């Protein structure tokens with residue numbers, strides 16, 4: 001029996017494809033929902049005990065940490081590999097080896113409810129003004145702007161757009177001792193975020209679940225989210241539009257993270273050979289990748305599938321947002337970055353310290369975690 005862990009977004013289609021796989025190969029497939037924010041942590045505790053799924057579905061930033069711990073299996077060259085975008089294959093590659101089969105690329109964008117927003121704001125200043133206007137006009141019941149503010153993933157577009165960076169790119173690879181998350185640019189982005197809080201357009205209690213449900217109920221005019229949520233908004237009957245996050249200044253764009261979603265094989269699994277057939281000879285096929293898109297419409301990682309859907313206005317709008325972005329690091333040292341920067345944004349939006357101090361603290365904590373090998377797990 002082949003077991004798969006994935007988020008709610010992929011469960012239905014992967015269970016369906018699982019029954020196709022069982023029909024053609026005689027091997028039952030059991031897909032199990034795991035909340036996305038728990039997949040890597042669950043896998044880290046489970047896989048070494050022989051209790052991890054055979055295949056996990058998730059983000060490419062996990063690759064380095066999982067690979068250096070011996071928990072995911074290298075993917076040997078296979079016929080269909082030539083059909084995937086280099087950016088997608090590079091995202092799932094670490095130290096010269098491929099460590100997953102990608103199905104999609106993604107980035108956040110401004111998603112807006114056309115019942116409240118008649119044109120895309122031209123700059124972040126215009127967005128803030130428009131949000132204030134909506135907050136006043138509909139009496140509080142409709143949020144002008146809301147997003148998962150304390151999550152570094154979602155606030156990165158601002159922090160990185162102004163010049164912050166996670167690790168410095170060098171000819172020898174990312175330099176994990178050179179961290180750019182408390183530099184001039186980083187501070188400047190985080191101040192814009194604290195400003196949005198100060199002017200009351202965002203609140204310290206803003207989070208993903210509230211944003212997501214408020215948008216689906218027709219009571220959020222503008223949010224920051226990715227392609228993984230658009231099906232839910234469409235199914236909910238929201239007349240939404242999508243654009244890149246408005247420039248932070250005239251001529252100066254936001255810089256979201258780019259993510260790649262993919263399938264990874266548990267190196268400790270007794271079913272690695274059938275899992276390899278599943279990923280390379282079944283899932284990676286043009287027909288199958290297209291069915292995945294229809295169920296979970298992120299930017300396909302197979303070029304010949306993206307070709308089928310390249311005119312879709314969401315694909316167009318998200319591609320433009322991604323075009324201005326940068327891939328998340330996948331090195332093992334990415335592991336501690338999210339919690340450090342999350343803690344720092346929480347401190348900042350709650351007025352518990354200054355921007356420059358909270359970020360300086362964040363970088364210090366990351367460096368301390370890297371120095372102590374937090375990304376290394378044992379027995």
Ligand SMILES: OC[C@H]1O[C@H](O[C@H]2[C@H](O)[C@@H](O)[C@@H](O[C@H]3[C@H](O)[C@@H](O)[C@@H](O)O[C@@H]3CO)O[C@@H]2CO)[C@H](O)[C@@H](O)[C@@H]1O
Nearest residue numbers: 007008009036059060061062151152153208228259338
């Ligand atoms: O917050 C830290 C977190 O950042 C990154 O995770 C982001 C994902 O890369 C991104 O895809 C999105 O996750 C969604 C799933 O893809 C989707 O299937 C569904 O389950 O909703 C998710 C959003 O709730 O957003 C997260 C950010 O929350 C990075 O990949 C993680 O390793 C890191 O922990």
